[PDB]
Design a protein around this ligand. Structure first.
Ligand code: MG
Ligand code: MG
Ligand code: MG
Ligand code: MG
Ligand code: MG
Ligand code: MG
Ligand code: MG
Ligand code: MG
Ligand code: MG
Ligand code: MG
Ligand code: MG
Ligand code: MG
Ligand code: MG
Ligand code: MG
Ligand code: MG
Ligand code: MG
Ligand code: MG
Ligand code: MG
Ligand code: MG
Ligand code: MG
Ligand code: MG
Ligand code: MG
Ligand code: MG
Lengths: 106, 48, 46, 377
RNA sequence: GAGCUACCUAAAAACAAUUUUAUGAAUCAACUCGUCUAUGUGGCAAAAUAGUGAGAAGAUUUUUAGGUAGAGGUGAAAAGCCU
RNA sequence: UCUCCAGGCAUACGCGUAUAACAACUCGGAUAACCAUUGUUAGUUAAUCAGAAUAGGCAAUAAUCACACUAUAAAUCACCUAUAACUUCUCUGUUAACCCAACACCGGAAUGCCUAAAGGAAAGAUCCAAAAAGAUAAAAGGAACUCGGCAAACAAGAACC
């Protein structure tokens, strides 16, 4: 199974292959994290909107950017926005990121 | 060298050495204005 | 309309329609070349 | 009580004085445009042949040529003039080098020639991202800044004139058009301008180089296409200023190749040309985003800095823009000139042996940190 | 001999503004065509000019390369077109 | 400097030195000036502009700001598995007022940007005839013109075979 494979049966086939059970919704622990007001970023809504506008319109010189450019850009901007929380939480310095990394199992 | 065959090179071949040179060049006055370092030459059409 | 401008130059068309490789492709074309060689033409083909 | 008509040239006549008045008529439309977008649109809508200036270029002595095209003075050194656990940064930066060079597993490039170049890109992206993250607590502005990867920075300007030498337009006077289209490896844009490095109207005895020949003799070629003034983002973006630019020298221009080509002296010149061209394009584009152009020169010096690396060695540059009045009409009486500061390239580390980086220099890391710690006042 | 023209194949391109039941619809440019008149008639031109007109998101127009050849080809048949 | 006109700059295809300077004043430009002519000498500079390893496995899901939608004419290598190789800049295009029309032809000629900041000059001098061509204005009348309201009009509306 590689990137371009498109399972005909969708998740049901993927659940069978990996021997996993599906629960709708994210874990309650994860959900409760952002309900806390302290996690809320300063000017969160405006910065996210600016990220969307920059990803889709401002970043390029062209009238209408293409998905092969803004799709990577929107995610990279979001991670940087979330990565700014190191001011509140010094622990976030113990994680790092790599790109285009190969994963494999048998 | 011009007007001669070069030995065809294949992986692992020797270096191509031209012991006597067939290329003749002449230094020419620039028609236009050139930087002081630049020098103009007229060279045979087969010279790289 | 005004006539006389039927030549619309294109080097790709010219060499493909009347060139050396085109003439040698068929025996009739080779005989064309032989005739021009016997006359002494400076230009055997385009 | 005699109302004599003003002594001005005809608007419609076929003369030089009449044409100049028609030039002012067009320029007045720019002065009267409220939006910054209209000013740029009016200033760039007409396309003509322009020299294409490459910040990274193999032409000999391109740095001196670039100064003339920009009216930039280059001063060797740094511009005249918080505990941050240097050990912690050293550990993180060393990890960045090891991660890409020794630890990550990826599908290697097919080319077999990009492998070295791709490796240099990977580490520089890692080094920039981590430092902008680790240094954010000390400098809060970096938290709100925008990090760009290989985004386009564009500047278009007129400087000088020439007489057309041939054709139906022989003898006509035409301005020399230049454009810089640049794609810095990384750049940081902030919403507040940095403090100036010297007062506007600052004067030094150093003289900008004068080139006897035309731009062509330095191998430079003209094309006609869209004129663009771009800072890396559109004018609507709040983050309209620049903080730092990171450039990676192409492998073609790296030290070992240059020595073999016998152009040893060009090792430093390659760095300087990239800094002068890239930073003038960025600061000039920032100034025009604020409404300043040749006929409305900047009231505030515009500042930006760049670190230029070949992947191992690093050089640091500071640029201050004082003049957008580079045209013949606007530069006739101008005492101002643009300033660039640069330092010799120094290695950041020597080699990676085993799983430990060897030869890491703290001094170079401080300069990167000091650049990233610059803040608006 | 299909660099013109007829038809076809492949790869491409262009179409503003204004209205509309939303389209081989309407108004009208660019663009394509060529209704009527005058001029021109060894002419600017071996078919044009100047006006006036027709279509103008389509069975539209246009570009590049290829194809079909005279006992033939092509033809929304004018026995029209194939330098 | 003035008066006036309003398709210009690039690329493609094509053309092949018509490019630029000097010197000439035979020929060429349908005349001069000046050169588009003759002779000599020069020119167009690119790693970014432009041109020029192998064997297997495999794909239901348009475009139109692609979201909502609607539609019908049904509409563009990659990725993976193995094998092999394990650091490179040479070559070619680049000038011009240019091409197809026997001509320095009121013709034909694709795309991008822009509409005057770019590009240009309708008058060799004089005269104010007829006829001829084009433009404007018209007392009273208003199709009486003519094969026909052709052409023109301060009109450009209606209707029927
Ligand atoms: Mg003919
Ligand atoms: Mg044709
Ligand atoms: Mg054909
Ligand atoms: Mg339309
Ligand atoms: Mg219609
Ligand atoms: Mg109509
Ligand atoms: Mg109609
Ligand atoms: Mg037909
Ligand atoms: Mg019939
Ligand atoms: Mg009949
Ligand atoms: Mg002379
Ligand atoms: Mg004569
Ligand atoms: Mg000439
Ligand atoms: Mg000559
Ligand atoms: Mg040219
Ligand atoms: Mg003719
Ligand atoms: Mg003009
Ligand atoms: Mg006259
Ligand atoms: Mg009248
Ligand atoms: Mg009357
Ligand atoms: Mg009657
Ligand atoms: Mg009568
Ligand atoms: Mg009539």
């Amino acid at each position: 199974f590689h990137q371009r494979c498109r399972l005909l049966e969708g998740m049901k086939q993927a659940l069978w292959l990996t021997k996993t059970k599906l629960i709708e919704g994210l874990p309650k622990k994860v959900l409760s994290l952002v309900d806390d007001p302290a996690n809320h970023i300063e000017n969160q809504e405006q910065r996210v909107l600016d990220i969307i506008s920059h990803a889709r319109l401002w970043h390029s010189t062209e009238d209408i950017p293409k998905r092969e450019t803004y799709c990577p850009l929107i995610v990279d901007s979001l991670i940087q926005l979330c990565k700014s929380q190191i001011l509140k939480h010094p622990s976030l310095a113990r994680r790092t990121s790599a790109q285009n990394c190969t994963l494999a199992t048998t | 060298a011009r007007n001669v065959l070069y030995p065809l090179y294949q992986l692992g071949g020797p270096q191509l050495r031209v012991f006597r040179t067939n290329f003749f060049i002449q230094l020419v006055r620039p028609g236009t204005a050139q930087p002081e370092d630049t020098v103009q030459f007229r060279i045979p059409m087969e010279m790289t | 309309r005004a006539r006389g401008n039927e030549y619309q130059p294109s080097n790709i068309k010219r060499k493909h329609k009347h060139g050396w490789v085109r003439r040698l492709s068929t025996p009739a074309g080779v005989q064309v070349i032989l005739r021009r060689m016997l006359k002494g033409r400076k230009s055997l083909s385009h | 009580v005699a109302r004599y008509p003003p002594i001005v040239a005809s608007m419609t006549a076929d003369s030089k004085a009449a044409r100049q008045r028609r030039v002012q008529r067009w320029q007045a439309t720019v002065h009267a445009a409220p939006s910054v977008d209209e000013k740029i649109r009016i200033l760039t809508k007409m396309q003509f042949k322009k020299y294409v200036v490459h910040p990274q270029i193999s032409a000999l002595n391109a740095d001196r040529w670039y100064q003339s095209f920009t009216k930039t003075v280059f001063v060797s050194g740094l511009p005249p003039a918080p505990s941050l656990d240097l050990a912690a940064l050293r550990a993180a930066v060393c990890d960045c080098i090891l991660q890409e060079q020794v630890y990550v597993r990826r599908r290697r490039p097919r080319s077999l020639f990009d492998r070295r170049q791709a490796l240099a890109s990977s580490i520089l992206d890692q080094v920039v991202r981590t430092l902008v993250n680790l240094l954010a607590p000390l400098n809060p502005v970096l938290s709100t800044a925008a990090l760009d990867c290989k985004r386009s920075v564009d500047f278009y300007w007129l400087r000088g004139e020439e007489r057309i030498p041939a054709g139906h337009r022989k003898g006509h006077i035409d301005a020399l058009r230049y454009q810089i289209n640049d794609k810095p490896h990384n750049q940081i844009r902030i919403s507040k301008q940095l403090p100036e490095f010297v007062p506007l109207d600052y004067s030094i005895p150093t003289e900008i180089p004068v080139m006897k020949c035309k731009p062509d003799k330095l191998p430079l070629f003209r094309r006609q296409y869209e004129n663009s003034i771009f800072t890396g983002s559109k004018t609507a973006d709040p983050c309209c200023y620049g903080h730092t630019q990171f450039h990676l020298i192409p492998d073609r221009l790296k030290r070992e190749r240059l020595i073999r080509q016998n152009q040893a002296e060009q090792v430093e010149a390659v760095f300087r040309a990239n800094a002068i061209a890239s930073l003038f394009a960025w600061t000039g584009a920032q100034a025009m985003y604020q409404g300043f152009w040749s006929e409305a020169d900047v009231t505030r010096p515009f500042v930006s800095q760049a670190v230029i690396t070949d992947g191992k060695y690093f050089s640091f540059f500071c640029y201050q823009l004082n003049t957008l009045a580079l045209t013949v009409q606007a530069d006739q009486n101008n005492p101002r000139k643009n300033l660039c500061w640069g330092s010799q390239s120094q290695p950041l580390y020597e080699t990676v042996e085993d799983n430990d980086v060897k030869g890491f220099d703290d001094g170079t890391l401080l300069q990167i940190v000091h650049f990233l710690l610059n803040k608006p006042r």
